[PDB]
Write a protein that binds this ligand. Sequence first.
Ligand SMILES: NC(=O)c1ccc[n+]([C@@H]2O[C@H](COP(=O)([O-])OP(=O)(O)OC[C@H]3O[C@@H](n4cnc5c(N)ncnc54)[C@H](OP(=O)(O)O)[C@@H]3O)[C@@H](O)[C@H]2O)c1
Ligand SMILES: COc1cccc2c1C(=O)c1c(O)c3c(c(O)c1C2=O)C[C@@](O)(C(=O)CO)C[C@@H]3O[C@H]1C[C@H](N)[C@H](O)[C@H](C)O1
Ligand SMILES: COc1cccc2c1C(=O)c1c(O)c3c(c(O)c1C2=O)C[C@@](O)(C(=O)CO)C[C@@H]3O[C@H]1C[C@H](N)[C@H](O)[C@H](C)O1
Length: 274
Amino acid sequence: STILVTGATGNVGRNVVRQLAERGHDVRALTRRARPGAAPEGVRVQEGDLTHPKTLKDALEGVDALFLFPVAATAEEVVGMAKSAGVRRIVVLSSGAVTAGYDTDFHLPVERAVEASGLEWTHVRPGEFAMNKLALWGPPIRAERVVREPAPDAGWFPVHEQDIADVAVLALTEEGHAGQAYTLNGPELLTHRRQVELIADAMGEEIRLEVVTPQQAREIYLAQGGFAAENVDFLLGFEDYGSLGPMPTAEAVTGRPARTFAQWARDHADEFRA
Ligand SMILES: NC(=O)c1ccc[n+]([C@@H]2O[C@H](COP(=O)([O-])OP(=O)(O)OC[C@H]3O[C@@H](n4cnc5c(N)ncnc54)[C@H](OP(=O)(O)O)[C@@H]3O)[C@@H](O)[C@H]2O)c1
Ligand SMILES: COc1cccc2c1C(=O)c1c(O)c3c(c(O)c1C2=O)C[C@@](O)(C(=O)CO)C[C@@H]3O[C@H]1C[C@H](N)[C@H](O)[C@H](C)O1
Ligand SMILES: COc1cccc2c1C(=O)c1c(O)c3c(c(O)c1C2=O)C[C@@](O)(C(=O)CO)C[C@@H]3O[C@H]1C[C@H](N)[C@H](O)[C@H](C)O1
């Protein structure tokens, strides 16, 4: 099958591309800047921008299935071009915050455009990415083998990006996923303190956890920049994002147990080294 993967250079898309290519599909990788190593050997890199849909004309020509990275502003226009091109199937990178009812204005409009098109679809709704912990704790672990945390006894069910790619790949390539939205959590509830331990384990190094205040925290997050600054308000509960609920995992789709945060830490150990 001819499959175009948008979000191809991303945490999830890199994996989707590699697996579709191994299955021997005819794979195309959309990026805003075409260069070697955006995709593996034998994968066609197409230059284009989801915010400028006319740039996608050549990328969508002759395509059977599409992995769609979420861009609510143009989703309807991109879906419309997919439909014109004769795409039969769209698999969406969405968010478990849609399942929860928190997201009605970013990922949901992308889903809604896809649902309204008449093509086959599957929504992949990951919960909290394990990658968030490289983004937030990488810099200080790499600097000082320390983590500064206001909520060490808090936590959720972080999900391994390869679980997300596994589900996307099946939705793009087998029957029985049409009209499903799969919410993807990690297999265990873990405290931030436990998450720091598992990184310490994966690295084979001590990491000191310094329990700080939320105020101290946000200054540190604003100093650090990048992911930690851009989301600091939402991460410390200064602004609202929106006995537990039944927590679904990739097992429901793959037939295999969801990857653990321990496994995730081992896969990314070297990215935490100084
Ligand atoms: N972090 C979480 O906990 C969380 C939870 C739920 C859902 N999500 C969803 O997952 C996404 C993150 O995916 P990820 O981590 O795989 O992505 P990533 O590695 O952070 O994202 C990079 C990918 O998005 C592509 N992209 C972005 N804007 C584009 C545009 N205008 N035109 C074309 N391509 C564009 C980039 O292409 P280039 O090569 O052009 O840069 C790149 O391939 C989030 O945006 C969110 O929608 C995240
Ligand atoms: C049961 O779910 C949770 C349980 C514990 C903590 C959490 C959550 C949770 O749902 C959650 C989020 O959904 C979001 C965030 C988050 O920290 C948490 C938890 O901490 C951060 C976030 O707001 C941003 O980074 C945006 O800058 C993105 C996201 O918000 C969602 C909903 C927004 N209204 C918006 O639609 C955005 C795009 O996605
Ligand atoms: C069940 O959902 C969750 C449960 C617990 C934690 C979480 C989430 C969650 O959904 C979530 C996110 O969706 C996003 C983030 C996130 O931290 C969480 C949780 O922590 C971080 C974020 O800033 C990025 O990494 C950059 O794209 C934004 C990202 O999504 C979207 C929304 C952002 N506002 C940003 O504008 C862009 C649209 O990415």
